[model samples]
Target: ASSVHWFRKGLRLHDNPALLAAVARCVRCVYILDPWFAASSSVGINRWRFLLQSLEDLDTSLRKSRLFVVRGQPADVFPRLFKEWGVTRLTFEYDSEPFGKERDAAIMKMAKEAGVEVVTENSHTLYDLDRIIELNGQKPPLTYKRFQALISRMELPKKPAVAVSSQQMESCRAEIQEDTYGVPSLEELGFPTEGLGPAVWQGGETEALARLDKHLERKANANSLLASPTGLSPYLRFGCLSCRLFYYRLWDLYKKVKSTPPLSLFGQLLWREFFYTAATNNPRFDRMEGNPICIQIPWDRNPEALAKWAEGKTGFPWIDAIMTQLRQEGWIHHLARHAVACFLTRGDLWVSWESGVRVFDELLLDADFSVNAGSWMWLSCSAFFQQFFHCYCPVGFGRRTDPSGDYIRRYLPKLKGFPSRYIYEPWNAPESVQKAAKCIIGVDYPRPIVNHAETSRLNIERMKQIYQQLS
Candidate 1:
């Protein structure tokens, strides 16, 4: 009897540790979509969309080979299926996140009792988990540069287009079970198809690969501050595109492009690994800023203000615009994410960062637990970023960076009638123009929830005291 290949996270075929192990050992591949993962996920549609793409990609890579996909409780399904399938060994990639760690542990304990030799491999990251642990030790690197130096030195694996041998292909082929369960559509999943923005969200491994190819083909270099034409955030979140595969594709493209812009643009993707390393090492990087002895500042619970922020109704055009983008589309620019986060936490200084995190969870399609939590901490005057200070000024930033308010006007159309100066501050709009725009300030549109200058001053003072204590 052949070994059993357990497909969990690392979904792509290229440079996949778990898949490669299974093929090397001549095992049958199986993808058991956990019932818990499907039904109870915080973001199920996005998850399903990605999983379907991943499975499709994995299956396609197998080409003439067959991949078996089963669905049910792991405890009940795996035991009975393994017995019937007559498998003794299990090979798979390991996940290091808190939830994945616990899940894998329980599965390992049960697999052992069944006399299954379960072999685990790490494929999600370019660096070994031990490296991150060794450098951080008891205290993780608080700044990106500190962590980047350590990370840049580590060797990373390169992925090539994967193809299965005829011998291995013949071994795992299973008869297509026509009624085998598959993912439901957005409507079937109880979600609406059409949404607010460009409707760019999609699923599948093929789609993910195409997205990367399309982005690279279009010269959407990351460093030049150019947006990736076909953003892969949604796909990468649910493992539709494996990290190694994405890295390798970009690596190949990077060699061809070979310019300062390509290097600069590609650096952002590397931050994903950076945060993962930080979270794995510190284990509490998100709970509190890197500082252990900092004061716990109070965050006001202004439900009205929070609602305005979440609904993208805040009178501040720039902040509301980003929030609107998040609502209509499931992603936002990294710069916009920081600005919006600061606008809620510092610009208004009323809501807590945790509140913003939860709200983000409700919207962002590519919301990774580690990145979202850590990013929020960094923006909310956390000690982790080093020399911690609230450096974001919404009005000033909006005028300088997102000038002309074009992006803001796109999402917050109600503010377009106001001249550029007053567009960011709806209260400054002339009464006639406000009525002409059909937006009644403080009613249809929210008033500037708190005076930006007054709130910013108060928040800055409070943050300075906190920063001093942290330093």
Candidate 2:
């Protein structure tokens, strides 16, 4: 029977059970991108650009087959498409995320009533999360230690599927009358082209493979993994790169090459799996009070302070620099992410991690619905790790990483004139030093908004009060 293969998160053809199952006649490889959502501010412009680029790049790779860009809601689109395309079967990669599951369940119900066969396979994560959840007595594992214990009993991840070829596309082939299904540009979507510049992170299967080759060649190093901006998180998030491929390749490298640090870091992938396992059954994983795992603490409702942190005008050059890089580039180092997260939550601002989650959801390219909130709670000390007193000092943490203040200067050019000693602590600069630096702390750059030393101290005691209640 002819089928319609929908593409959502699993954008690539490699190791895609859903894409392969749909086959090479009436096989329609589709991306249902609602134009209405395009106009929404829920997703930032840079993230939108990267997504479109992946779609455009995939269009080039489809060869004889065409990648259909269907414009409508998935629920509304599929029923209409079933009749329009004469589709009898539908296949899609499994989406374990909460919203996707709800939508998929609705579509599957309609498909069953329509006499259309449907198949959804696990491809996004390495292991079947449901199984992992089951192994943990039907409860999600809260910590990484328990998660590793569960994983040790299991076997390796599934081998990646054979790469999809144009030849395989020959049988079902494609049907297109004109360029009607062409990819949309930023302008057509009404997004302003003003703020966008050269992209540090590119998207698509081709780029992923190119990056993979770059990694195997040892051109990239582990030091950049956390402290630097150059990373492949976006590729994994968009499904341009296969997780299975990345999994075995690390082992393959170890089998051939000797003493690989990158291969040893393969355990990094499980951190995602751990979060997914924790989040799968929990409906309110993103919220604070209702979320079972999260410890409730009184967070301030200060808009003015929240705005300062979001816009990178927080007066602390380190926090401001990271925020600037996050906004301008739509990505940041993991430790930098932790640095900012700690500042917003139990660290300094005493604001809710919920606020930070929304900011990251809009900006972070690797923003997994599960991992984003998961990491936020961890940093904020709302859940996971319970050490409330341990906080990331805005100046101290940043200064320790790059004492030369090069990272700060790179993103915040206004503070570039201040040398290493004065850069991280520009507000402390003498009048003579401030004159030389050209940018006065309170005038040119923002003054340190809230006193970090005083606030963190107060917030910790407040957190200590909350944690005692939890006990």
Candidate 3:
């Protein structure tokens, strides 16, 4: 008679169809902290901290019904819990990623063997990524324009589900062990809480909704097109907020301003959908090697170069600043992401996009499997892009955006005292200027790792050669 609502990606209480289904069945909800995720090098401590915070917030939102937290393999844990609780139904939000698809299939098999029903709903993206691929004639749309055209042809996504009542939740309490009912502490998960670095973004439906409200409130006053992004990505990434809710709100705002597609906030959501569909169709989306779409180029495997880049000691002030910001904060602005990713890839190092992808995967709080891979591919011009020669200059690029170099100064305090002209290119400053600033190039600060002008020209030549060979 009871159902188990498996909270995976959709962590929020409101606008969650699976959670509503579980409540309608009048059973308890279970959040399984799969040890596989905890142990994955792909997920760093910052992400762990954020996920745990979201889970804890979810527990509080459950009202009388407790979120049963369990640790282990889902195959091992779900069967035992189903039998123990007499659960006849299992429901979860649909995950289209390769791992999720495989894992869900195995779990569904386990449930089937136990005579339990499985219910999966699609809520991560606006529409089903599979359906998007299907409509695009069985091939994922490679370009945003093509993808947008394909999406325009399809019907709008389903409306968001209404909020479930507390009484409704209380009636569905699953007979979970009291010992496992509360959220687990970071200490329990073998992570120290102290000195974990500042998390600028907090996780939860409450915070997510508040952020959306604030962004919408200020949308009208902004002189620029979309006003520097809503910073609601992490919330969207974790499903603390519903995509449908986000889209409809942005759609209303767009209508008020008569904003066009590809430039509007709606366009951003579509981009997310694009990556989701692309990643779904291509299993090799993560790697450049053996990937049909990703162009082949012999990437350098210099560990020292990689080490400097990762540690924010790359000697390029602009690149180092962004890298430091990424490590310190799990998120950065889009253009900032472009700069560092370019520096690591075709711009300077000519390292494999996979290297940069891995770093972003580990550090980015909003890092989705599809988006991270797609962004890296685009930045490196490895796939879904062709402009390899239009590389970003680590110095000129940042200076153009923040002429005062405030962003660089904020992230790299060692260069704070340098003049605006030399802030982006501190290595260009005379030794006296460096001493006046109390930061010495090659001493207090690192000298440029690679001569940007020389390296950029050589990298561009190599890219041209590769493109020619590929052609």
Candidate 4:
């Protein structure tokens, strides 16, 4: 029986048990690009960039095998292609998130009808989904303590060895040119191939491997994952790089350093699986909760305020920097995400974090439905029984965390000339300082669009009302 290996998420071959197993059974591989899904949702410039790069890498590596490329609804498209290609078996990695899970269910039904035997491997998470549960039959723990304890029980896997040679698979070479597969342009995939600026990202298995190697060897630090490994997110999100590959490499680094701090970095990876578990268990994680608390929160819809925040013209330098980074880099550090999110939802209190959701949906390359919704609600005081007040006073937070204003200066270059004291609160910059900075309070960056102190007080009252009304 001929097998058709389907490439959807796990696009890289490194540490890709799913792909390795498929290569053992299947000679023909099909990477279907579903335009409907890409157009309607899961579409963003970062994702498109990552996907195109991964496809190019896949084409280069699998040059010997028949790699089928098709575009349409997977259920309808795969059945027709299966019949034409004489595909009697199908192989893929299981998708754990809500939409992917539902989409897979539809595709599996069609594949079965077409007389294809489907094989799926769990490839997205670091630990097996079952291993991450609570000890006493409780739901998964919310605290990192329980997570670390669960992880401590298992010996983390070693880094992936280089792949088996293509020379051994002579039969797989017959359908392709003896050495290479064709790569379609981004235009061919209905996206702009060129980046908005010069290429900040390179998307190949070789490039991904090189990056992983750098993170493990050259960039080992407590904060290394924050800056160095962040570049890998969009790639990991789009399946250009395998999570298991990242996990093992991270483990390798952990062994060398013998440090526990990086465990938090590792926990961030597991958080994805945790959200996946939530989506699988409840489904509401991806959508608004049905509980009255979530349903009744007073959500504001002020576009003007949101526009100021999105455009990076908000007078809060820290908040402005994070938003600016998000627009330009397609990512912000985890710390910054929480800070910026807190500033919007708590500090400014113009509206619920929902205000930033649609805007972020367009911007963040590493956006995930369950994670995004839940995290925003968690940070914005919109979630049920949230502990921390979502009100973040941005000026105090910046001075408290990065007192030197180095972080602010890096992102808000226009604010570089101000002394550290005033950089944290640029609106406090003297008229002379603003002149030296070559920016006006309102004309250039927009003066504090909202008074932080006043808004903070109002938001506290608003928070009480929200809790009473919603909960």
In the range 1-471, model 1's lDDT, one tens digit per residue, is 457777776666555666666663346667776555555655635445545656765676665555667767667887887787777778887776766677777888888898877888776765666667676664556677777666656555445436346776775565545635443334544455575233456556667778877776744421212235567776666666667666766666666864323223446556676666666634454554443622366778788778878887666777777787776666788888888888888656557787788887767877766677777876776545545455566677677675566776777776666667666776777788788767778877777666777888887787777667755
Models, CA RMSD each: 3.8, 2.2, 2.8, 4.0
Off by over 4 Å in 2: 219-230, 257-264
TM of each candidate vs. truth: 0.85, 0.95, 0.93, 0.84
How far residue 159's Cα lies from its native spot in candidate 3, in Å, is 1.7
RMSD of 4: 4.0
> What is the C-alpha lDDT profile of model 4 across 316-352, one tens digit per residue?
8878877877776677777777877877666574566
lDDT scores in order: 0.66, 0.82, 0.80, 0.66
TM value for model 2 = 0.95
Q: Give per-residue CA lDDT, model 2, range 1-471, as digits (tens).
A: 888888888778788878878773568888988786787757788788889888988888886487889887888788888988788889999988887888888899899999899999999899999999888888888888778877777877799988667766787686657767888888877788985676778778888878876676543322442333335678888888888898888777666756424323676578877777788777788999888898878899888889999999998999998998888778888889989998998888889999999999998888878989898988888777555548778999887888888888888898878889988889999988888878877888989988989998888788878878768
Q: Write the per-residue lDDT of candidate 3 for residues 32-100, one digit (tens) a residue.
A: 785656755446677777887888877777654667787876888987888777878899999988888
After superposition, candidate 3 runs with Cα above 4 Å error: 34-42, 174-179, 195-198, 218-230, 257-263
Which model scores highest in TM-score? Answer: 2
RMSD of 2: 2.2
Q: Where does candidate 2 have its weakest 10-residue lDDT segment?
A: 221-230
